[PDB]
């Protein structure tokens, strides 16, 4: 009841924040935002 509600909300919170949302594992953006010298792909992973 009480703990059931708390646990339910915590479960949804964990399942939602833990969603591996698409991060910047992208070529496109830098590919056509950083016009630099040609190479394969250089994700600015600094």
């Amino acid at each position: 009841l009480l703990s059931a509600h708390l646990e339910q909300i915590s479960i949804s919170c964990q399942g939602i924040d833990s969603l591996p949302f698409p991060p910047p594992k992208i070529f496109t953006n830098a590919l056509l935002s950083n016009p630099d010298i040609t190479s394969l792909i250089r994700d600015t992973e600094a």
Binding site: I37, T38, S39, L40, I41
Partner: protein, 79 residues
């Protein structure tokens, strides 16, 4: 003799027909020459579109080489 006069008249008609046939054959060959010119033009247009395939083929291979990167300089050719 008069029958032979009619014979030469028949031959006259035949010669007229033959002259027309000769003229037509010459015109035919002339048309073949013109045809060859047009066909050459067609082939030229086809070669142009072959150039277009060369563009996209190099595009595809160039991308695939970059796409298939699974582990340089800037020297290229700019005509």
């Amino acid at each position: 003799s008069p029958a032979l006069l009619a014979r030469v008249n028949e031959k006259k008609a035949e010669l007229e027909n033959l002259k027309e046939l000769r003229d037509l054959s010459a015109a035919v060959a002339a048309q073949m020459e013109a045809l060859e010119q047009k066909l050459s033009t067609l082939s030229s247009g086809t070669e142009a579109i072959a150039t277009v395939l060369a563009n996209w083929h190099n595009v595809l291979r160039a991308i695939s080489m970059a796409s298939a990167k699974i582990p340089p300089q800037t020297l290229v050719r700019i005509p």
